A paper describes a structure:
Our work utilizes biotin–[name] (Sav) technology to develop artificial metalloproteins (ArMs) that mimic the active sites of natural copper metalloenzymes. Our group develops artificial metalloproteins (ArMs) using biotin–[name] (Sav) technology to mimic natural metalloenzyme active sites to characterize otherwise elusive intermediates and study the effects of the secondary coordination sphere on metal ion(s) reactivity. This approach leverages the strong binding affinity between biotinylated metal complexes and the Sav host to confine synthetic metal cofactors within a protein scaffold. By engineering ArMs with aromatic residues within their secondary coordination spheres, we systematically investigate the influence of these residues on Cu reactivity and oxidant activation. Our results demonstrate how the inclusion of aromatic residues within the secondary coordination sphere influences the structure and reactivity of copper ArMs.
Residue numbers in the entry:
A (entry chain A), B (entry chain A), C (entry chain A), D (entry chain A): 12 to 134
The structure:
């Protein structure tokens, strides 16, 4: 079971901080703080993970969303990360993400950025 | 405010059904049922949306996650949709999505599918 | 063989025009004209397709690149489309695309947009 | 001008080898050899890059396509990489990619993988 492996504080290669609790039922809840972009302080996150992953050495699939509104700022956008948790001495959450921002219909072709973040327990 | 616009039952071009409640605080909660892939019946979803979007004609950014485990099936995978809600007579949620499935490290380069779903209130 | 099916003029849902010749060796060459974004008139495109696709009803994989520089404009960016050609009475090229624009290293997390275009022989 | 910077042999984090010539007109031509997946030996690649990039420290946008057919194997698929070249002592091509494989229409929702490769001149 990866409940204990996922729960806690994670850091990605940009210096962002991802604080998460994995519930026994597959829930992810916590906060996200981005070191880049139109963001400051913490934002609510929610997501889901596979709470009964394979036992063949495969990673644990998961995903979560942040909408970039909090009491300080509203960037009219949301990011979803989709990835897998890989436990062990150098545990990692390897993700790809989609950031959609609100646009008019004329500009909707240009409304989604894509990228990739790797999270570790150190740094 | 788009709380009332988002909450309810949505359908995409594959025949999938997305049932969601938008909370006043930006929460998305509900269930998802996929007409394709390794899925049957309903799965828990959670996500976030911008609860104070622009008023200039821009869409409302949002995102949500489904992990594909329920009491019937476990497909060791999770999908996140990232998109914007566009209200009106033919309201729509236009999304792009990432489906990550658990893999070994050797196969992780091939662990994420990408696609796009458009949800409407009819069909 | 889909050489004859692919070669010709295609249109996507934005009003863009894709003019392509499929070579017997798997080459794609032609021009692209975008109805949106920092673009005007025609841009060089090059790409590749599967010149011996399956015969089981599967689509024909292909992809191509446009760099958005021509004699009129330079938008310091490039788009790649990746998709499959599906022949018949309503033939189609269904794609997803990545648009990367030049950025500094500080802004590289935000350098790639993702989207999807569907091309038809009419419109 | 990045013609000289791009032309040559590149390696990504999977052990794949990308051999490319950048033409003065913005053309990319060469061969690709993948260390993973349904691939063996070299495949034709073609693409485009920005031949007059900004001079403000921004990367050089580019993209290319490989269709995974050669004299040995046909994997009925094509990958496009979209990214930017960043010159200097540790030059790099940072990409994201889309791999589409031929599918029936019923399976087309699952026809595209997405990932990210980083290429260097060493390794
Ligand atoms: O920047 C954000 C929110 C923070 C994103 C951080 C990302 S999430 C993925 C990656 N991983 C991280 O840890 N951090 C980064 N949203 C942009 C929304 N704007 C578009 C946009 C796109 C690129 C750069 C700036 N803006 C639209 C807009 C609406 C109102 C005002 C201003 N702008
Ligand atoms: O199919 C699913 C879950 C349902 C996805 C429906 C998508 S979500 C986006 C799109 N929109 C929709 O409404 N529906 C579709 N997960 C695949 C996980 N497997 C890989 C995979 C990839 C493609 C096809 C089948 N499998 C790995 C695996 C682990 C154990 C057993 C079997 N397979
Ligand atoms: O707009 C373009 C080129 C045309 C893209 C058309 C796309 S391709 C996919 C889709 N399908 C189509 O048929 N058309 C659209 N490049 C943007 C580069 N800029 C970022 C950017 C992002 C969004 C909107 C405007 N700019 C950076 C920049 C460098 C210098 C000056 C100005 N800007
Ligand atoms: O594996 C390939 C070609 C090589 C891709 C290497 C990628 S490109 C991006 C990344 N970067 C690299 O340097 N290497 C990797 N195509 C898969 C096509 N098949 C689906 C598929 C998906 C995942 C794994 C295996 N197959 C469909 C199919 C058609 C007929 C027979 C068998 N299979
Ligand atoms: Cu912004
Ligand atoms: Cu599966
Ligand atoms: Cu621009
Ligand atoms: Cu394969």
């Amino acid at each position: 079971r990866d409940e204990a492996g996922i729960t806690g504080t994670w850091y990605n290669q940009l210096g962002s901080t991802f604080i998460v609790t994995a519930g026994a039922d597959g829930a992810l809840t916590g906060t996200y703080e981005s070191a880049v972009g139109n963001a400051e302080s913490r934002y609510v996150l929610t997501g889901r993970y596979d709470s009964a992953p394979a036992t063949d050495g495969s990673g644990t699939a998961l995903g979560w969303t942040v909408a970039w509104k909090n009491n300080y700022r509203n960037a009219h956008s949301a990011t979803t990360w989709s990835g897998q948790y890989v436990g062990g001495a150098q545990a990692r959450i390897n993700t790809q993400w989609l950031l959609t921002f609100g646009t008019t219909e004329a500009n909707a072709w240009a409304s989604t950025l894509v990228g990739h973040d790797t999270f570790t327990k150190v740094k």
